[PDB]
Amino acid sequence: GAQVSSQKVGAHENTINYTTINYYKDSASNAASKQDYSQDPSKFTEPLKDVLIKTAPAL
Amino acid sequence: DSLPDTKASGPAHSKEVPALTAVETGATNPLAPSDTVQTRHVVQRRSRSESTIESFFARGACVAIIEVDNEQPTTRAQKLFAMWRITYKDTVQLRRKLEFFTYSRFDMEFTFVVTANFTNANNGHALNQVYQIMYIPPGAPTPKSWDDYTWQTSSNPSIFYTYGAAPARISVPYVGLANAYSHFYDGFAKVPLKTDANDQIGDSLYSAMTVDDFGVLAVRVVNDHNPTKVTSKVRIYMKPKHVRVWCPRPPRAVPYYGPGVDYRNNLDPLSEKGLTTY
Amino acid sequence: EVQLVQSGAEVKKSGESLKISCKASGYHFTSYWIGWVRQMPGKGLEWMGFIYPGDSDTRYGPSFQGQVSISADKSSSTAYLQWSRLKASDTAMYFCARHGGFASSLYSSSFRPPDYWGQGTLVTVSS
Amino acid sequence: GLPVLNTPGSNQYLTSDNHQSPCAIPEFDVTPPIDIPGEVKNMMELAEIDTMIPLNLESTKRNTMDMYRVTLSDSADLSQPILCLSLSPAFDPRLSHTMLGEVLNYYTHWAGSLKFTFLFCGSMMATGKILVAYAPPGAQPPTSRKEAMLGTHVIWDLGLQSSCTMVVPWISNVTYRQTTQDSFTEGGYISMFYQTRIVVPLSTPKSMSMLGFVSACNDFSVRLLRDTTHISQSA
Amino acid sequence: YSDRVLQLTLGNSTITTQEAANSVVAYGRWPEFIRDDEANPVDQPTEPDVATCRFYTLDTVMWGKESKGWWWKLPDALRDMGLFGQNMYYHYLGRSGYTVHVQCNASKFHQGALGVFAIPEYCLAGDSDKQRYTSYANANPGERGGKFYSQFNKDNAVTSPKREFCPVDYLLGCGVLLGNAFVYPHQIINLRTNNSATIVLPYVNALAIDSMVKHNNWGIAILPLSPLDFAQDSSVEIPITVTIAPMCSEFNGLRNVTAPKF
Amino acid sequence: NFMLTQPHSVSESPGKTVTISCTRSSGSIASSYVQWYQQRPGSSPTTVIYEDNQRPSGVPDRFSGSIDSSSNSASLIISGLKTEDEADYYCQSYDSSNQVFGGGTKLTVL
Ligand SMILES: CCCCCCCCCCCCCCCC(=O)O
C-alpha cells in the first residue's frame, strides 16, 4: 500500500515520481508530507465588515 | 502553486484613485505595482513553498544539555543521574520561533545525542556504556537513587541507548489537555477569596496554567562504576511535525527573562541612524 | 551509634581565631558531606558551608567571605569549623550535620540534606 | 536473508531530515481539534500586514515612542528631504525590526514588491502636498526634489483620505536579492520631499507628526531558511 | 448610506456615530454559540441573551499631552456590570464575544491619534526581579484599568513589594516593539478623520469554554501614536470613553457565588 | 533571593489539632523537597520530616507532612497536641545546591 507522488524538478539532466510507505500504526510516526497549500490573508489584511474595492474611496 | 502573474498596465487618467486610502479602518491597501506605474506582462514562477509553517518549523533545535557521571556512589560529588524538566523555554531560538503565534497543535520528534569523555589519566580503562532515558509523567514516582525500584520502567516509556550507535529518536503525539497548546496564558491557577484565612492560600504564579506540565526525563548510566570517573552529556533536539498555528503575535524584541514575558536588562534593541541618511 | 559529637561551649576574645570540632562515631567520617549551621540567639538557623575532603569546599557565607573556614580530618574522623577574626556578630550556636547517604542525583531529587545533628556548640565571651 | 549494502551517510543525524520514527506513547487518545479563529498557513501572510516603521532613530529618539513619528511643519525649509531610507528590508536599521524585516531575517533570499503607506496625523484644517520617490541603485542617492522626481515617485495630496500608498516595483538584475549587507544586490533609495508646503490657518498647531507603514505585495517570497541575529543567549 | 455613519443596537441599548471609520471583525469571525460537536461539558447551559448582551460603559479617562496609554482586560472589565457580572461569578465556566466601542471626539483644530488594539492572551510584564510574581488583585484592575509607562523602573522595595505590572509603552508592555502591534485586530482614531473605533471580538481560546474569573481572553490597549496638541496650550485634555457589550454569552457550571478578594 | 515564610505563632491546649504551614518562594516546589525540624527549649535541632513523604526514626505518627503543589506551601499537621510539643519548628529545603531555613514558628500548648 505505497503512495507515489510527483517531484518538483529544479535542475534537469541532459515527471519524476517518488515512493512513500508508512510502517507504524500511530500517525505521530509518519513523516511530514509537505504538500500543504496557502490561503487568503484577507482575514488579517482586510478584516473589515463592509469590504470595499481598492479603487473606490476608503471612506 | 506559483505566485500570480503581473498584468500589463498603461497610462491612467481616471476618477478612481487606488493610491489614496485610510489606514484608520484597520485594513491594508491591497495594491499591486500595476496600480501605480506602467508594467509589462511577466509570467511568475517563484513560489512560497519555503515559507509554509511545516517548512518554517522543519528543523531540530537543541533544548537541553543533561550531564551524568559513572563513578562509585561514595567517592566524589555524586551527580550520577539527572532528571530534566521537559520544556522548550531553556533556550531562546526555538522559543522565539514558536512564540510568533498564540496557539499551536503539532506532533513532536525527539533526538538524543550522547557524548562521553574521561576525567583522569591514571588508568584509561572503561568499557562501552549504555544509557537509560525514562519518561516520568506527572504524578508517577520519581527515582531517588540511581538503582532504586523506579527504574524497572514497568509502564513508563524508556529508551536504552548504547554509546557509539546512531542517535536515538522517538515521536510523540499531541498530548495537550486542551485543543491546542497555549504559548501564552493570561490568568492564574488559583483565585483568592474573601473568606480565605490568609492571602497566601490563594497565591499563585501569574501566567502559569499548571505545575509539572509534561513531567521529567530521568537519565542514568546502567553500567556499574569503573575505576575511573567517566562523564557524559545528553543533548535533546525537538522538531515539531504536522504543525498548525493560530493568532500571530509580534516577535520578541528584548532578551528573555524567565519563563514569563518579563524583561529586565537591555530594552534598547534599535541602533542609531540619521533621519535623512541613506 | 550513628551520632555526631561536638565540643561544649567555646570562648574567645574579639579579633582572635577560633576552632571547633565535630567528631563522628560508628562509621567512616568521610562517607558523605558535612554541613555547618549557625543559629544566633532567638533567630532561625543559617548556612555556613557544605564540605567534603575530596576538595575541601569551604563555601563561605556571603557576608563572611574568608572569615569562616571548614576542613575534615580522616585520621581522627572529625571535621573542624574555623574563624579567622571573631566579631561581636559571631556570637551564636553552631551545629554540625550530615546525611546518611543515598545521594546520587545531579539535581534536587537525590542530593540530600542531613538527618543527624550534633548537640551544638556555643561561642560567647563570659560576663 | 538480508543481502543489503550500506551507502555513505548511514547512521548520521541531519537536523533537516524527514524520516519516520517509532511512537513512544502508542494508542494515545488525541484530543480532537476545534475551529479557533485566526489560523495562519504561511509565514508571508504575516509579512503582508502593515506595521509602523521606526523612521526617526535619532540619538534621543531611538528606543522611545518618538522614533515612530516624523515631524512635519510649515516653517521647514523646502529644499531638503524629509526622510531617507535604503531599500534593504532585512538589514536597514529602520526596516530591520518591522514585521516584514523580522520575517525576512529568518531567510537569506527575498524577492518581490513592497508597499509604503504614510499617515498624516495633523489637524483637519492643515493641508499640503508631498512627493515620495524611489530610485533604483547605480547613481548618486537623491538629495533634492529635482533629482528625486526623475525616478519612480508619487505625489500625495492631503485631504479627507489621510493615507497614501506607494508601491516599490520589483526591479533587480538578480532573481533573488540577499537579506544581508551587500552592494552587488543593493535595493535602491527612498526619499521624501515637500511639494508646495504645509499651510495652516491661525490658532492651529503649526507642526504635526506623520507615521509610515511597510508591507509586502502579493508577489513577495523568500526561499532559503537560516537563523536570526535578533535573539541572543548569554552563558 | 455610508460607512461614515453607523448604528449598533444590542439588548435595550443603542449607539450612534456620525464619523466612524468602519467596523472591524477580528479575524473575520462573528461570535457564535457552542455547537453540539464541540461542547466539552454536559450540563445544560444558561443563555441570558438580552439580560447580559448589552452595552456597558466603563469609567471615562482623560487624555492629556503627557499620558502614555491605558489598558483593560476582558471579561475582567465587566465583572461588576450587573447581570453579566452576577452570571460570571455564579458559574464555574463562561464564554462570550464582545463588541468594543471606543469614543473620542475633538474639534477640527485638534490633532492626535490613538491606537486601539485587541490582543488575545495579553500577558504583561512585572516590576521586580522575581518572575511571574504579580498578585491577582493587581492584575485585575476592573473597569479602572491600568496605564503604560515611558521607561522601566525596577521595584527596589525590600518589604511589602508592590507586585504590579510595569508596562512600557514602546515595548507594548510585553517585550515586543510597538510597531509590530498592528498584526492584532486594531483601529486608529485620527482626530482629523474619525472620532470612534468599533471592533467585534469573537471568543478566542484553546478550549470550547473556560473559566472567566481565572483567565482573561482579550486585552484592550489604547496608546497615543501621535501626542495631543490643540493651540500650543499645555493644559489641553479631552476624554476617552470605552463601551463594551458581551455577545452570545453562555454559562455552564452553576454553584454558590464567588467573592474574589481585592 | 528567596525565603520560606511561616505563620506567626500558635497557642493551643492539649488535645487540639493544628496545621503549621511554610510557603516556598523560589525554585520549582515539586523539584526540591521541604523538611521540618523541631527545637525544644534549650535543645539542639532534630529532623522530623523530609522528602514530603519520609519520616525519620523516633518520630511519633502524630506528626505528618503534606504539600500543596499549586500554592507552593508545605504543611505539618499535629493531631492530639501534647504539652511536650512545646518547641520551635523550622521548615528546611534544599533547592539544587544549598539549604535555606525558614523564619521559625513558635507553638504553645497549655
Ligand atoms: C513527551 C511530552 C511532549 C511535549 C512536547 C512539548 C510541547 C510544548 C508545547 C507548548 C506547551 C505550552 C504550555 C501549556 C499551555 C498552558 O500554559 O496552559
- CATH classification of the domain holding B211: 2.60.120.20
Nearest CA in chain A to E22: A48
In whole angstroms, what is the distance from residue B163 CA to residue B113 CA?
A: 10
- As for how many domains chain C has, the answer is 1
Helices and strands (H and E) in chain F: how many = 0, 11
Cell of D108: 537569506
- CATH classification of the domain holding C38: 2.60.40.10
Strand C78-83 to strand B216-221: parallel, antiparallel, or no bridges (unpaired)? Answer: unpaired
What DSSP designation does B64 have? Answer: E
CB pairs under 8 A between B and E: 150
B218 three-state secondary structure: strand
Those residues whose C-beta lies under 8 Å from the C-beta of residue C116, and which sit 6 or more positions away, are C2, C3, C4, C97, C98, C99, C100, F47
Those residues whose C-beta lies under 8 Å from the C-beta of residue D16, and which sit 6 or more positions away, are B58, B59, B60
Those residues whose C-beta lies under 8 Å from the C-beta of residue B275, and which sit 6 or more positions away, are D55, D56, D57, D58, D70, D83, D84
Does residue B87 have its Cβ closer than 6 Å to ligand 1?
A: no
Cell of B214: 509534561
Q: Given ligand 1 and candidates B177, B183, B205, B245, which is best to mutate, with the most ligand atoms within 8 Å of its CB?
A: B183
- Closest approach of chain B CAs to the CA of C8, in angstroms? 31
In whole angstroms, what is the distance from residue D47 CA to residue E35 CA?
A: 34
Tell me how far the alpha carbon of residue F32 lies from the centroid of ligand 1, in angstroms: 22
List chains touching B (3+ CB pairs under 8 A): A, C, D, E, F
List chains touching A (3+ CB pairs under 8 A): B, D, E
Which residue has cell 509603552? E169
In whole angstroms, what is the distance from residue B198 CA to residue C98 CA?
A: 36
In whole angstroms, what is the distance from residue D50 CA to residue B30 CA?
A: 10
Does residue B228 have its Cβ closer than 6 Å to ligand 1?
A: no
Helices (H), chain F: none
- As for how many domains chain B has, the answer is 1
Cell of E84: 453579566
In whole angstroms, what is the distance from residue E94 CA to residue E211 CA?
A: 6
User: Which amino acid is located at D57 in the chain?
Assistant: L
SS3 content of chain E, % helix, strand, coil (to 5): 15, 35, 50
D99 closest CA partner among D114, D109, D120, D83? D114
SS3 string, B131-179, reads EEEEEECCCCCCCCCCCCHHHHCCCCCEEEEECCCCCEEEEECCCCCCC
Nearest CA in chain F to C114: F47
C15 closest CA partner among C67, C50, C93? C67
Sign of CA dihedral D86, D89, D91, D94: positive
Structural domain range at position B12: 1-278
HSE on the CB side for D66, CA within 13 Å?
Answer: 11
Contact D129, D157 (CB under 8 A): yes
Contact B103, D36 (CB under 8 A): yes
Which residue has cell 465588515? A49
Structural biology method used: cryo-EM
Cell of F8: 506567626
What DSSP designation does C111 have? Answer: S
In whole angstroms, what is the distance from residue D53 CA to residue C116 CA?
A: 65
In whole angstroms, what is the distance from residue F34 CA to residue F31 CA?
A: 10
In whole angstroms, what is the distance from residue C4 CA to residue C117 CA?
A: 6
Beta strands in chain A (DSSP E): 3-6, 17-20
Does residue B101 have its Cβ closer than 6 Å to ligand 1?
A: no
Q: Would you list which residues of chain D are within 8 Å, Cβ to Cβ, of chain E?
A: 34-38, 46, 49-54, 63-65, 67-69, 97-99, 102, 119-126, 160, 162, 203-206, 208-209, 211, 213
Cell of B158: 524508556
Strand C121-124 to strand C10-11: parallel, antiparallel, or no bridges (unpaired)? Answer: parallel
Sign of CA dihedral C47, C51, C55, C56: positive
In whole angstroms, what is the distance from residue B180 CA to residue D35 CA?
A: 11
Contact (CB<8Å) B211/F21? no
Which residue has cell 509502564? B155
In whole angstroms, what is the distance from residue F23 CA to residue B54 CA?
A: 44
Contact (CB<8Å) B20/A58? yes
CA distance from start to end of chain A: 58
In whole angstroms, what is the distance from residue E201 CA to residue E187 CA?
A: 13
Kindly state whether B208 is in contact with chain F, defined as any CB-CB distance less than 8 angstroms: no
Distance from chain centroid for Cα B222: 29
Those residues whose C-beta lies under 8 Å from the C-beta of residue E187, and which sit 6 or more positions away, are B24, B25, B26, E21, E22, E24, E102, E116, E197, E198, E199
Query: CA separation (Å) from F78 to F20, F66, F69?
Result: 8, 11, 20
Query: CA separation (Å) from B111 to B94, B213, B237, D17?
Result: 15, 21, 5, 12
In whole angstroms, what is the distance from residue D152 CA to residue D135 CA?
A: 6
In whole angstroms, what is the distance from residue D25 CA to residue D122 CA?
A: 62
Looking at domain F4-109, its CATH architecture is: Sandwich (2.60)
Tell me how far the alpha carbon of residue B141 lies from the centroid of ligand 1, in angstroms: 21
User: CA-based Rg of chain C, rounded to a whole angstrom?
Assistant: 14
In whole angstroms, what is the distance from residue B179 CA to residue E34 CA?
A: 14
Does residue B110 have its Cβ closer than 6 Å to ligand 1?
A: no
CA angle, residues E196, E200, E201, in degrees to nearest 5: 130
Q: Would you list which residues of chain F are within 8 Å, Cβ to Cβ, of chain C?
A: 31-33, 35, 37, 44-47, 50, 56, 90, 92, 94-104
Long-range contacts of E170-174 (CB under 8 A, 24+ apart): E170/D63, E170/D64, E170/D65, E170/D67, E171/B253, E171/B254, E171/B263, E171/B267, E172/B250, E172/E221, E173/E71, E173/E124, E173/E125, E173/E148, E173/E221, E174/B261, E174/E122, E174/E123, E174/E124, E174/E125
In whole angstroms, what is the distance from residue D26 CA to residue D31 CA?
A: 15
Nearest CA in chain F to C119: F44
Cell of A35: 504538500
In whole angstroms, what is the distance from residue B178 CA to residue E209 CA?
A: 10
In whole angstroms, what is the distance from residue E247 CA to residue D210 CA?
A: 37
Residue of C31, C50, C105 to mutate, testing the B interface (most B Cβ within 10 Å of its Cβ)? C105
- CATH classification of the domain holding E22: 2.60.120.20
Does residue B214 have its Cβ closer than 6 Å to ligand 1?
A: yes
Nearest to E231 among D50, D54, D203 (CB): D203
| E208 CB neighbour count, 10 Å cutoff | 20
Phi, psi for A18 (deg, rounded to 5)? -135, 150
Structural domain range at position C49: 3-124
Q: Please state whether E89 falls in left (phi above 0), alpha (psi between -120 and 50) or beta.
A: alpha
In whole angstroms, what is the distance from residue B175 CA to residue E153 CA?
A: 40
**What burial class does residue E89 get, using C-beta atoms within 10 Å of its C-beta: 0-12 exposed, 13-18 middle, 19+ buried?**
middle
In whole angstroms, what is the distance from residue E106 CA to residue B92 CA?
A: 46
| E59 CB neighbour count, 10 Å cutoff | 11
Structural domains present in chain A: 1-59 (4.10.80.10)
Does residue B86 have its Cβ closer than 6 Å to ligand 1?
A: yes
Kindly state whether E9 is in contact with chain B, defined as any CB-CB distance less than 8 angstroms: no
CA distance from start to end of chain B: 37
Give nearest CA residue, ligand 1 atom 13. B182
Cell of E220: 484592550
Cell of E183: 498584526
Nearest to C115 among F32, F44, F56 (CB): F56
Contact D99, E180 (CB under 8 A): yes
Nearest to D65 among E27, E38, E169 (CB): E169
Phi, psi for B52 (deg, rounded to 5)? -65, 165
B219 three-state secondary structure: strand
Tell me how far the alpha carbon of residue E175 lies from the centroid of ligand 1, in angstroms: 22
Contact B183, B101 (CB under 8 A): yes
- As for how many domains chain D has, the answer is 1
D28 closest CA partner among B171, B109, B105? B171
User: CA-based Rg of chain E, rounded to a whole angstrom?
Assistant: 19
SS3 string, chain D, reads CCCCCCCCCCCCCCCCCCCCCCECCCCCCCCCCCCCCCEECECHHHHCCCEECCCCCCCCCCCCHHHHEEEEECCCCCCCCCEEEECCCCCCHHHHCCHHHHHHCCECEEECCEEEEEEECCCCCCEEEEEEEEECCCCCCCCCHHHHCCCEEEEEECCCCCEEEEEECCCCCCCCEECCCCHHHCCCEEEEEEEEEEECCCCCCCEEEEEEEEEECCCCEECCECCCCCCCCCC
**What burial class does residue B212 get, using C-beta atoms within 10 Å of its C-beta: 0-12 exposed, 13-18 middle, 19+ buried?**
middle
F39 closest CA partner among F94, F105, F95? F105
Phi, psi for E179 (deg, rounded to 5)? -60, -35
- As for how many domains chain E has, the answer is 1
Which residue has cell 489606514? B23
Contact D43, D211 (CB under 8 A): no
Burial per residue of F79-101, b for 16 or more beta-carbon CB atoms within 10 angstroms, e otherwise: eebeeebebbbbbbbbbeeebbb
Contact (CB<8Å) E124/B195? no
User: What is the widest separation between alpha-carbon atoms in chain F?
Assistant: 40
**E strand or H helix at C78:** strand C78-83
B42 three-state secondary structure: strand
In whole angstroms, what is the distance from residue B149 CA to residue B23 CA?
A: 66
In whole angstroms, what is the distance from residue D23 CA to residue B109 CA?
A: 9
Give nearest CA residue, ligand 1 atom 2. B214
Residues of A within 8 A of B107 (CB-CB) are: 27-28
Question: Is the bond leading into B248 cis (omega within 30 degrees of zero)?
Answer: no
Phi, psi for B149 (deg, rounded to 5)? -65, -25
In whole angstroms, what is the distance from residue E201 CA to residue E219 CA?
A: 11
In whole angstroms, what is the distance from residue F73 CA to residue F24 CA?
A: 6
Query: CA separation (Å) from F65 to D170, F25, F42?
Result: 71, 19, 25
C40 three-state secondary structure: coil
Structural domain range at position D179: 1-235
F44 closest CA partner among C117, C44, C42? C117
- CATH classification of the domain holding D226: 2.60.120.20
In whole angstroms, what is the distance from residue F24 CA to residue F3 CA?
A: 7
